Coordinates of C-alpha atoms and ligand atoms in Angstrom, one line a residue:
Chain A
X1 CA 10.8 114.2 -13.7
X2 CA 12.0 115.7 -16.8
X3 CA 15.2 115.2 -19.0
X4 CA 16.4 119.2 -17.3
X5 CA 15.5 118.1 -14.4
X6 CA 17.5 114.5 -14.3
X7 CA 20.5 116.3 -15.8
X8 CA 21.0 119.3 -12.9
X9 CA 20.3 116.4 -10.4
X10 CA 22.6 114.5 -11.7
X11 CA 25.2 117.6 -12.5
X12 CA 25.4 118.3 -8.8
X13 CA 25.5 114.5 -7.6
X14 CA 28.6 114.7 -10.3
X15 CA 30.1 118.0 -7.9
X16 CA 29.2 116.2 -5.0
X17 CA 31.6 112.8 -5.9
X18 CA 33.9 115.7 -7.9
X19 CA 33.6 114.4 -10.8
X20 CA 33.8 117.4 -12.7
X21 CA 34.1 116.2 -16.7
X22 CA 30.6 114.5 -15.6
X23 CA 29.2 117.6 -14.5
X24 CA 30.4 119.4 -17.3
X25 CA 28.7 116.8 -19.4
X26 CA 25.3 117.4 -17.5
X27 CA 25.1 120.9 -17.5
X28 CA 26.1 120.8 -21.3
X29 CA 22.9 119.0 -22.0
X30 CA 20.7 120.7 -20.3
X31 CA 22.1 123.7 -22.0
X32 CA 21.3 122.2 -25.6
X33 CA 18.4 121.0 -23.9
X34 CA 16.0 124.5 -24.3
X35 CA 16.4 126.9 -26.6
X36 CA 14.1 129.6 -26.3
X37 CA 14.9 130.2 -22.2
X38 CA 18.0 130.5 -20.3
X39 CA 20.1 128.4 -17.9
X40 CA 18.3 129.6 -14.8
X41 CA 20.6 131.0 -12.2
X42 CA 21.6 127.1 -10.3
X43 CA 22.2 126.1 -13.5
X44 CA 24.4 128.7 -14.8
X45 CA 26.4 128.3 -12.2
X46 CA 26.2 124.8 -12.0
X47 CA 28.0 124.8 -15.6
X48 CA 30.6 127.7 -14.8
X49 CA 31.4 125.9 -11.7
X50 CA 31.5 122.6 -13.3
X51 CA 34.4 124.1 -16.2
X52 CA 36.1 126.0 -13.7
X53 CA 36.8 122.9 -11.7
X54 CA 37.4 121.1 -15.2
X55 CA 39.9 123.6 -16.5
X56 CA 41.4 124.8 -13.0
X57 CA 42.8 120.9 -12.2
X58 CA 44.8 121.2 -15.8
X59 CA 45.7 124.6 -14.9
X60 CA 47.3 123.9 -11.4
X61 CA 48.8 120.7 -13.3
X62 CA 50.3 123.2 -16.0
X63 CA 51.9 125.6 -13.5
X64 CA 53.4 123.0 -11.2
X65 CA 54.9 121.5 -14.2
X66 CA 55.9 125.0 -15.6
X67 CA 57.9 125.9 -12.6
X68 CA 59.3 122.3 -12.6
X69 CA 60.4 123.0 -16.4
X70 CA 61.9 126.4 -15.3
X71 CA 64.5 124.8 -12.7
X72 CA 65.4 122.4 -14.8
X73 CA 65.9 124.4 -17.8
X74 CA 68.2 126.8 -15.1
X75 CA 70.2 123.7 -14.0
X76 CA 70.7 123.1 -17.8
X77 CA 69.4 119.8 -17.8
X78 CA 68.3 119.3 -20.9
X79 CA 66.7 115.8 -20.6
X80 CA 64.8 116.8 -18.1
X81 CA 63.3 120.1 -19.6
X82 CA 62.6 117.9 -23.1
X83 CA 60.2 115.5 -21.1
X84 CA 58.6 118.0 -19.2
X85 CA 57.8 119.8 -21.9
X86 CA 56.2 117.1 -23.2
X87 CA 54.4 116.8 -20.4
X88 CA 53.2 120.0 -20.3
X89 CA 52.3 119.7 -24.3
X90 CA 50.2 116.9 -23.4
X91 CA 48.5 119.2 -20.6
X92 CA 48.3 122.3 -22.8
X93 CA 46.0 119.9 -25.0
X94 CA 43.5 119.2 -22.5
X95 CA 43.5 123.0 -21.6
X96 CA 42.7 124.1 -25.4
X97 CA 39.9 121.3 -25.5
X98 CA 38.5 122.7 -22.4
X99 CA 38.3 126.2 -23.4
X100 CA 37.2 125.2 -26.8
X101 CA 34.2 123.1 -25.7
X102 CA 32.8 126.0 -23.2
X103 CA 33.7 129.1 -26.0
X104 CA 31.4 127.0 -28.0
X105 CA 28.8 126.8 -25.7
X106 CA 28.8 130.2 -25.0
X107 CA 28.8 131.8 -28.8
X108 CA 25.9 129.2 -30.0
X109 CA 23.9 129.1 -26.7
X110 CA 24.8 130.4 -24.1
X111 CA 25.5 134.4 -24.7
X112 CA 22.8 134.1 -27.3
X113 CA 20.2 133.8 -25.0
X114 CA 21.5 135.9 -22.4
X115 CA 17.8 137.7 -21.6
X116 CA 19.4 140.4 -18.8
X117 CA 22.3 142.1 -17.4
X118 CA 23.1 139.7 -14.7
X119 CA 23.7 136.9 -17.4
X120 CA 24.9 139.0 -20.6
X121 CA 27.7 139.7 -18.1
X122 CA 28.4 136.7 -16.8
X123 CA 28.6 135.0 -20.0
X124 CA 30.8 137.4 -21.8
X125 CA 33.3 137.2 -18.9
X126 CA 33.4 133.6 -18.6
X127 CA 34.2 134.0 -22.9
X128 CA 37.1 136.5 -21.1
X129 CA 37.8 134.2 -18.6
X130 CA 38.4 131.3 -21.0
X131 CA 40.4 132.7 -23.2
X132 CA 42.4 134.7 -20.6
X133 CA 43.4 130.8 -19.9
X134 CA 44.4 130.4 -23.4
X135 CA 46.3 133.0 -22.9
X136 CA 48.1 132.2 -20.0
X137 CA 50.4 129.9 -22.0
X138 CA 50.5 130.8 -25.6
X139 CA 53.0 132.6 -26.7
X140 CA 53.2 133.8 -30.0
X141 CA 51.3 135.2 -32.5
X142 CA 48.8 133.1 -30.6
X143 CA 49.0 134.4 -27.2
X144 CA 48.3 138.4 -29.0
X145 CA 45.4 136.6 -30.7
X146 CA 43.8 135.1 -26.8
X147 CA 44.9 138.1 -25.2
X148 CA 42.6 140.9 -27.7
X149 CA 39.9 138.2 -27.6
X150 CA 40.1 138.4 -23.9
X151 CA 40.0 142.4 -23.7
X152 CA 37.1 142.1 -26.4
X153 CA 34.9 140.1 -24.1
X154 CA 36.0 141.8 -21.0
X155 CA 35.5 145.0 -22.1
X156 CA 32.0 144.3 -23.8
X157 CA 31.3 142.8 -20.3
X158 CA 32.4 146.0 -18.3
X159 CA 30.5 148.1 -20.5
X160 CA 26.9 146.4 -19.6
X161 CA 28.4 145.4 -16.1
X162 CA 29.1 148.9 -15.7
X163 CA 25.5 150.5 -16.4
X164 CA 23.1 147.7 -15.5
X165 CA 24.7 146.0 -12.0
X166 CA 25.2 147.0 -9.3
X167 CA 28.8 148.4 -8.1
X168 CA 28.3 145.3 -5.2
X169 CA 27.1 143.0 -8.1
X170 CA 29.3 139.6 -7.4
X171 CA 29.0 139.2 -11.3
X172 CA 30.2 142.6 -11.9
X173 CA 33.0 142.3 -9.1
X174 CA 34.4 138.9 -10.5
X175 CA 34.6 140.9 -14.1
X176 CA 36.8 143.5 -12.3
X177 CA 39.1 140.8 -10.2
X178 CA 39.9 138.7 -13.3
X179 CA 39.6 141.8 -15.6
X180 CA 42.0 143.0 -13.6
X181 CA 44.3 140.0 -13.0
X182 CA 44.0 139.9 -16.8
X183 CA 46.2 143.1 -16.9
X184 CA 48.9 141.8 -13.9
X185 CA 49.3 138.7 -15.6
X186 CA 48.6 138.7 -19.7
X187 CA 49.5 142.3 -20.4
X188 CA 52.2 143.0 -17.2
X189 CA 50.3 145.9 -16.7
X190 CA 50.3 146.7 -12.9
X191 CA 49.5 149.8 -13.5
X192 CA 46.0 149.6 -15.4
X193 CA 45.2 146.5 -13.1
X194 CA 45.4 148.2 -10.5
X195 CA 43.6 151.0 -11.4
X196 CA 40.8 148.8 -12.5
X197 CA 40.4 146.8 -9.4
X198 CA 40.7 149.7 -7.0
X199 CA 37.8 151.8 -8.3
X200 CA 35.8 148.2 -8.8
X201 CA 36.7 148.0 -5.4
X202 CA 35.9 151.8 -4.5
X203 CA 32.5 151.9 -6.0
X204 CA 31.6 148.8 -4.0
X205 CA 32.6 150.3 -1.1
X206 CA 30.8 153.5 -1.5
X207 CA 27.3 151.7 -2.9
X208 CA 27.8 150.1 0.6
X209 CA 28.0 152.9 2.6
X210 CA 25.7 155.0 1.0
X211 CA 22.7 152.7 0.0
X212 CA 26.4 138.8 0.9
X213 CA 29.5 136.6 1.6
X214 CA 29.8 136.4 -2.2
X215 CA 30.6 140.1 -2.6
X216 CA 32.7 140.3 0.7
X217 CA 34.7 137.5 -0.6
X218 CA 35.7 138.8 -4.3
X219 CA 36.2 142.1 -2.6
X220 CA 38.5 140.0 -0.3
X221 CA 40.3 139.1 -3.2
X222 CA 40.8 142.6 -4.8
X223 CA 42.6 143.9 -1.9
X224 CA 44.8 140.8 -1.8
X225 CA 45.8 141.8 -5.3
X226 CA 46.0 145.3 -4.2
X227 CA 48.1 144.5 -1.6
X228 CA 50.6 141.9 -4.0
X229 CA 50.7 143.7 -6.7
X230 CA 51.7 147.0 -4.6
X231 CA 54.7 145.3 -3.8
Chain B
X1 CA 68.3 108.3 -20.8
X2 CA 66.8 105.1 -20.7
X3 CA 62.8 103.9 -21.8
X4 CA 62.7 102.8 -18.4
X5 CA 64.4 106.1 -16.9
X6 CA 62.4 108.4 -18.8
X7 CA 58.9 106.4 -17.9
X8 CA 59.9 106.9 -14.1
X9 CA 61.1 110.5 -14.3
X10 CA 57.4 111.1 -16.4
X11 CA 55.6 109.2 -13.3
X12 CA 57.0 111.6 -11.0
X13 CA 56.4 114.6 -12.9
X14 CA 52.6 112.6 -13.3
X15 CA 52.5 112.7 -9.4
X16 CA 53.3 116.2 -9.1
X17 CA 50.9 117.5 -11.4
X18 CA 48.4 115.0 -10.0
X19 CA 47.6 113.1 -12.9
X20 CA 47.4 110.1 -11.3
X21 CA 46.0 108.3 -14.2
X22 CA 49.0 109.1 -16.7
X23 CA 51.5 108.3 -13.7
X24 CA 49.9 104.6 -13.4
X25 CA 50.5 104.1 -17.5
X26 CA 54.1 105.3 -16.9
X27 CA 54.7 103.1 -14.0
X28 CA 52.5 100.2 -15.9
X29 CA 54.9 100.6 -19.4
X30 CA 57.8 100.2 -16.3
X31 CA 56.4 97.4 -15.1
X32 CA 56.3 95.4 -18.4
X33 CA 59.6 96.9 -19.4
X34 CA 61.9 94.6 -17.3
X35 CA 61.6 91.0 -17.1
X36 CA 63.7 89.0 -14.9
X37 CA 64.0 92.1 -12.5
X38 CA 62.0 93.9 -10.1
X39 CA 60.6 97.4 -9.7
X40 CA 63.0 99.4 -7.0
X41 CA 61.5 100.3 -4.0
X42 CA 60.9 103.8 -5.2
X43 CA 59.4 102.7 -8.6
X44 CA 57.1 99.8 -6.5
X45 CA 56.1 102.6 -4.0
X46 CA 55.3 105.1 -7.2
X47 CA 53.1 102.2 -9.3
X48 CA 51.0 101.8 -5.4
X49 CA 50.5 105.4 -5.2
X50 CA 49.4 105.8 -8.6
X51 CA 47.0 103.3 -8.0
X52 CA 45.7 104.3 -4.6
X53 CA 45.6 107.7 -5.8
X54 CA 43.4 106.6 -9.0
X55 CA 41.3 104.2 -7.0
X56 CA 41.1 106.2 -3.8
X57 CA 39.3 108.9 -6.1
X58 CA 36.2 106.9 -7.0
X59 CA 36.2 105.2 -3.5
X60 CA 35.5 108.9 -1.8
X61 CA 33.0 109.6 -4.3
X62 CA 31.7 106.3 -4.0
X63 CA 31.4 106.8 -0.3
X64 CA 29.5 109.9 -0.9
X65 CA 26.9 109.0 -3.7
X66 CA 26.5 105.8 -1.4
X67 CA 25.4 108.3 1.4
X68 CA 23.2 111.0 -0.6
X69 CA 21.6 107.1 -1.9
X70 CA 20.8 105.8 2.0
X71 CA 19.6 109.5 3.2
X72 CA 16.7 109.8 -0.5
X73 CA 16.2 106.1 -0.1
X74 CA 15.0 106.7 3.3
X75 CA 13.3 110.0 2.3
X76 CA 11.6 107.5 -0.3
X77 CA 12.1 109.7 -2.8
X78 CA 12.4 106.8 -5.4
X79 CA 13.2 109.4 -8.6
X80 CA 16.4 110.4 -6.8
X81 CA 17.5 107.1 -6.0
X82 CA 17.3 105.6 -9.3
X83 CA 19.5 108.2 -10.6
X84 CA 22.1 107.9 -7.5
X85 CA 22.3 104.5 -8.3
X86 CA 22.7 104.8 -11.8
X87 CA 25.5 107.2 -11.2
X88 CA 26.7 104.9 -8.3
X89 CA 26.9 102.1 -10.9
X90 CA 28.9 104.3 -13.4
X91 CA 31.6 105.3 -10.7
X92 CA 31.3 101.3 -9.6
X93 CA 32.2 100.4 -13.2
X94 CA 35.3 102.6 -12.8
X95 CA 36.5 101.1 -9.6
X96 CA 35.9 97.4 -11.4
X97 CA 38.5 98.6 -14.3
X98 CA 40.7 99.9 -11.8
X99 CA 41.1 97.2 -9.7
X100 CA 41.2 94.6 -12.6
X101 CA 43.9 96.6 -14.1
X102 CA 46.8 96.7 -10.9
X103 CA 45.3 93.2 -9.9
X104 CA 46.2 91.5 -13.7
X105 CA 49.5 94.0 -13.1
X106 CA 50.1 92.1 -10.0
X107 CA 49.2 88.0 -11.1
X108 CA 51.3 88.7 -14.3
X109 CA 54.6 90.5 -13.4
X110 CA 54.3 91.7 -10.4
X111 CA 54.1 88.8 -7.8
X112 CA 56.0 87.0 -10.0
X113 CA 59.5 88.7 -9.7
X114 CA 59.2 89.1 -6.1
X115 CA 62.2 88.2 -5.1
X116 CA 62.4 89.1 -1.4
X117 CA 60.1 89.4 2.1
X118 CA 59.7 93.2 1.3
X119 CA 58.0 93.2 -2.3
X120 CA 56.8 89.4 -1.4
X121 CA 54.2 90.8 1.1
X122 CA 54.0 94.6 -0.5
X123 CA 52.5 92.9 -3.9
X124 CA 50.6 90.1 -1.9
X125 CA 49.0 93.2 -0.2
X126 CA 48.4 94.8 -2.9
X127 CA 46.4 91.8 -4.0
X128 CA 44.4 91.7 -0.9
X129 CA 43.7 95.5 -1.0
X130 CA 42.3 95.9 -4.5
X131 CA 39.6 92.7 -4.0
X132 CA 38.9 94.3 -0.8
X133 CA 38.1 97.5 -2.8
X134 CA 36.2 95.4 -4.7
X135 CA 34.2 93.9 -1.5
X136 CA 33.2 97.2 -0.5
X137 CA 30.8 97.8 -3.1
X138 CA 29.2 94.4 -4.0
X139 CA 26.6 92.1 -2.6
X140 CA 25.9 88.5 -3.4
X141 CA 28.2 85.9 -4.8
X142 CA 30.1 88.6 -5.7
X143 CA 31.1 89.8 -2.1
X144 CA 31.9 86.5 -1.1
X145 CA 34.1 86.2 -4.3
X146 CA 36.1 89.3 -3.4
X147 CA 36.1 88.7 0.2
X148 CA 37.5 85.3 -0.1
X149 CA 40.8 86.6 -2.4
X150 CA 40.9 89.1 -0.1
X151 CA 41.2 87.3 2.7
X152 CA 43.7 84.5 0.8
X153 CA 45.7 87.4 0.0
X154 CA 46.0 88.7 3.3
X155 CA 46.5 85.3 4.7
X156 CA 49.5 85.0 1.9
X157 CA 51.2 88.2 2.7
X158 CA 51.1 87.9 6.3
X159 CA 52.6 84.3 6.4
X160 CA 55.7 85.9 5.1
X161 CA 55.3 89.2 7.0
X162 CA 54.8 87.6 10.1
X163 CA 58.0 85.4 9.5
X164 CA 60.4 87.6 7.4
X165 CA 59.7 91.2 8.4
X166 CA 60.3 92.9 11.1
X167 CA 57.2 93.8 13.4
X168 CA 58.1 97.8 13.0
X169 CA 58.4 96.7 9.2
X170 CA 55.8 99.9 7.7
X171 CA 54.4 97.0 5.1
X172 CA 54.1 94.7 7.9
X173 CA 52.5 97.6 9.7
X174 CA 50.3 98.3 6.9
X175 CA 49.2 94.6 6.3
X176 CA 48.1 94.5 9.6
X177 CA 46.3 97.7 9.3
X178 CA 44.4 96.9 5.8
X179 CA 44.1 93.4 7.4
X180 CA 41.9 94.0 10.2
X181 CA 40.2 97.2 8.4
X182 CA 39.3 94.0 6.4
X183 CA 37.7 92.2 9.5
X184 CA 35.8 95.0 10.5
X185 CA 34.6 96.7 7.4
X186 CA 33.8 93.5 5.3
X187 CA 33.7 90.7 7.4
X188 CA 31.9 92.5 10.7
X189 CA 34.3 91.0 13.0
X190 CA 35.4 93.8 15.1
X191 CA 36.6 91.2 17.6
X192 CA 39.2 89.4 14.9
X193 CA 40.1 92.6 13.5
X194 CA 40.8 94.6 17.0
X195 CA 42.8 91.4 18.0
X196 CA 44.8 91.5 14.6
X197 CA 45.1 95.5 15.1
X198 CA 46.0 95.1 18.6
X199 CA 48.7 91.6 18.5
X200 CA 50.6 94.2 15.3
X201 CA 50.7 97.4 16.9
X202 CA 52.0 95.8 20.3
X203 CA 54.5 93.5 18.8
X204 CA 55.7 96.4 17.4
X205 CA 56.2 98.2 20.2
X206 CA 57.9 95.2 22.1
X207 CA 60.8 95.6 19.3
X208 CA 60.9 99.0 19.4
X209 CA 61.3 98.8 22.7
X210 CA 63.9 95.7 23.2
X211 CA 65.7 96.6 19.8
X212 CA 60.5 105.8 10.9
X213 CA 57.7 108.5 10.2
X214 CA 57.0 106.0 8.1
X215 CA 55.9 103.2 10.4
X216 CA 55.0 105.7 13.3
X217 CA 52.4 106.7 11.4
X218 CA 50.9 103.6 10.2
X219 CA 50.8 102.8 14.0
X220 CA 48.6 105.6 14.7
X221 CA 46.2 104.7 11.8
X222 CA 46.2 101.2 14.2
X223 CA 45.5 102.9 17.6
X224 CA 43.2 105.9 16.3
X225 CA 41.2 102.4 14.7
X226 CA 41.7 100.1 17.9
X227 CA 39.9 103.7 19.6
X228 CA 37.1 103.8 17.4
X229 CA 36.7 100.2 17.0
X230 CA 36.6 100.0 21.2
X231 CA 33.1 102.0 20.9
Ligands
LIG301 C1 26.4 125.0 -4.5 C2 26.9 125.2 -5.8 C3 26.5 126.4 -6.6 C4 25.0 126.2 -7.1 C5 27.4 126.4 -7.9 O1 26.6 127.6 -5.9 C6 27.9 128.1 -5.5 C7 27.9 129.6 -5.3 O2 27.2 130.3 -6.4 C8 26.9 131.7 -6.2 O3 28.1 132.5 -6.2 C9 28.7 132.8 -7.5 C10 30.1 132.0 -7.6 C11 31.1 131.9 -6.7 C12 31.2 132.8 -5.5 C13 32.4 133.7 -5.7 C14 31.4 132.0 -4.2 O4 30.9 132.7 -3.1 C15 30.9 132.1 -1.9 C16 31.3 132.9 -0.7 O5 30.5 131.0 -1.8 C17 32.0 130.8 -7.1 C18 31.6 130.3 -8.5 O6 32.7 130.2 -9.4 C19 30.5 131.3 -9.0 C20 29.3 130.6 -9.6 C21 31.1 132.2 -10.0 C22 31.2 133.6 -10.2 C23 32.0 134.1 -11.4 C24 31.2 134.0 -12.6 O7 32.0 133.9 -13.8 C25 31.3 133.9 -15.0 C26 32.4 135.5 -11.0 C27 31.3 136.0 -10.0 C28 30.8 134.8 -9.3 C29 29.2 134.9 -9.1 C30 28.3 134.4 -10.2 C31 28.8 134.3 -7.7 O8 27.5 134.8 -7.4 C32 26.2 132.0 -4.8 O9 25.9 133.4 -4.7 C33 27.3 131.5 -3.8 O10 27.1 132.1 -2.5 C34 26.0 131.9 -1.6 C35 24.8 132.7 -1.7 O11 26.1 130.9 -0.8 C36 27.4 130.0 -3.8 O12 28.3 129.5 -2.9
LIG302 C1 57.5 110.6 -2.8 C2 56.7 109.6 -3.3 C3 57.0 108.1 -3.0 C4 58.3 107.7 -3.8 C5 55.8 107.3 -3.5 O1 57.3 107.9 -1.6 C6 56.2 108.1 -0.6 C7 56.5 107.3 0.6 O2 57.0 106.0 0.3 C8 57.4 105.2 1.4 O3 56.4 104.8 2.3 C9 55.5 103.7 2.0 C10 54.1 104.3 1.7 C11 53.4 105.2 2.4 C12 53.7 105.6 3.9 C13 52.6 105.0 4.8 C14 53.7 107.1 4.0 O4 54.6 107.4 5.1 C15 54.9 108.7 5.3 C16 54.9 109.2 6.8 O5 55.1 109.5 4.4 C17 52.2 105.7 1.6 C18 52.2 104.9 0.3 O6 50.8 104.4 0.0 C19 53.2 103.8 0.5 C20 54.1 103.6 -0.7 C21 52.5 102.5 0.8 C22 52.5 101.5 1.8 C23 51.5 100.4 1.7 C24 51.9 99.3 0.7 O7 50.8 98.7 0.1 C25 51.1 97.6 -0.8 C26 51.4 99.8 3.1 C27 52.7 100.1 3.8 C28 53.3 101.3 3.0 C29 54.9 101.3 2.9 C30 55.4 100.6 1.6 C31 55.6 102.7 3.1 O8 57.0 102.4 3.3 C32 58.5 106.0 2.2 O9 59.0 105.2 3.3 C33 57.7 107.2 2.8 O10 58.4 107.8 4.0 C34 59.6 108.5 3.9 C35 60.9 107.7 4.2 O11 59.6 109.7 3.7 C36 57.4 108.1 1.6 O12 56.7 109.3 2.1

């Protein structure tokens, strides 16, 4: 058995008891493990499913504790808002951590050694991706500084996305979802955001009718946003 | 707002989010706040959940690593089952710290300001359930060690159960439950533990009878075990 080898095993024993942090870990060492080569595809998606599970706890945490904050604030108690606040400080930190480890990852190792389409895309969204959660509650000069770094790696995604995947690519319809969900929600921009995830969503459609559950389902999820965010 | 008021209020928000580490510190600072007092109901019931929340984690992905172990152990795939093990042992160090932590809670403060039936036998529980934990996962002297305070414990808490609460009492309830989960999981008496189920869930109905969603469902955990237990 080899060091790569004893890490992935142990990465998705770590998924398997949901330990995500310890998958994280796992995946993060096999990453600085080689140099040369890239994740393979199990293991890129081994370490994208690890973080997403690592940052999406903190971010389910952060939005029930956001709303929390909001009734409070509207029922003017002002005790109660201070503490949640604090709270939510406390879970903003973790958040930034998070998204700072794996934007570190990706500029150093990962994106560097991105040897096709099907990874050079899915590395520069996850760089979207993790700074669209940055973004998601910032608010200042800040948030304009997560939000253009968020457009800068989606649209450098789109553009090879665009010309070397596949219209049906799951990699290249994920880009468009949060791409898309990255105009609804960052820039309240219904109107781009839809655009953008109807003629994703199109161009799927036609591919498929001219020329995998993983495609069916993000596609699932466009018309879901279609359908919300027509309303 | 008080130290005490504000620890609670963070607890809750804790729960909500699902942070069930931070809500154990908040409800541990509460606990070695007051002195001569005792947690409320609500902050005793808050400090449990924390705790089976934060135990109950490492327990599932105990349970699973422990199966994933049996199924490459009997494979003989010997690589995989040194490094199941070795995770095993990391989440098994977890549960330790855990359990150490509520059970010094309980010896120090805890049981100590017990001052009625209801927390008497809730915290004398509690004592029995966490060495039980601890039973689960261990072998030679060690089991024996855990099994015994469990069973002391248990012994302790229904003494004072069986004489000061009422038999539809939900900790009652509970102590039989964890009681004879105790028989048939750690001892492998499934006749001691069936009786134990059996004598609490029909003593309970004899009150109810003669004389809460809370105890109702505690009694279904009792029949849907006195079922399974039956085959
Ligand atoms: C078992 C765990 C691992 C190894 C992580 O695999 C999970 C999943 O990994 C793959 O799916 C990817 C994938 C996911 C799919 C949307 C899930 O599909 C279904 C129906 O199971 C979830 C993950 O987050 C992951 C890896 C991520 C992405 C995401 C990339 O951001 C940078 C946007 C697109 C999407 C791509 C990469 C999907 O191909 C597979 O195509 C999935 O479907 C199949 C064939 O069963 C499998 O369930
Ligand atoms: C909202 C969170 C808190 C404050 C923790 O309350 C959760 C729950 O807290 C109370 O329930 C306790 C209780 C639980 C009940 C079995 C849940 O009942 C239902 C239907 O919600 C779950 C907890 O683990 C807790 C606190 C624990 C125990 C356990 C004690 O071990 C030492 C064995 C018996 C049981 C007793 C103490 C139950 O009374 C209440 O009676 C519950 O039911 C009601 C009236 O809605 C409420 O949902």
């Amino acid at each position: 058995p080899t060091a790569r080898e004893e890490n992935v095993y142990m990465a998705k024993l770590a998924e398997q008891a949901e330990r995500y942090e310890e998958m994280v870990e796992f995946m993060e060492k096999v990453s600085n493990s080689l140099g040369s080569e890239e994740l393979t595809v199990e293991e890129r998606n081994l370490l994208s499913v690890a973080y997403k599970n690592v940052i999406g706890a903190r971010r389910a945490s952060w939005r029930i504790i956001s709303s929390i904050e909001q009734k409070e604030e509207s029922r003017g108690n002002e005790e109660h808002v201070n503490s949640i606040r604090e709270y939510r400080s406390k879970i903003e930190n973790e958040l930034s951590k998070i998204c700072d480890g794996i934007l570190k990852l990706l500029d150093a190792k990962l994106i560097p050694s991105a040897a096709s389409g099907d990874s050079k895309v899915f590395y520069l969204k996850m760089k979207g991706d993790y700074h669209r959660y940055l973004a998601e509650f910032k608010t200042g000069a800040e948030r304009k500084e997560a939000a253009e770094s968020t457009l800068t790696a989606y649209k450098a995604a789109q553009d090879i996305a665009t010309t070397e995947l596949a219209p049906t690519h799951p990699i290249r319809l994920g880009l468009a979802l949060n791409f898309s969900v990255f105009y609804y929600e960052i820039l309240n921009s219904p109107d781009r955001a839809c655009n953008l995830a109807k003629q994703a969503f199109d161009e799927a459609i036609a591919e498929l009718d001219t020329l995998y559950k993983d495609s069916t389902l993000i596609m699932q999820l466009l018309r879901d946003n279609l359908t919300l965010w027509t309303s």
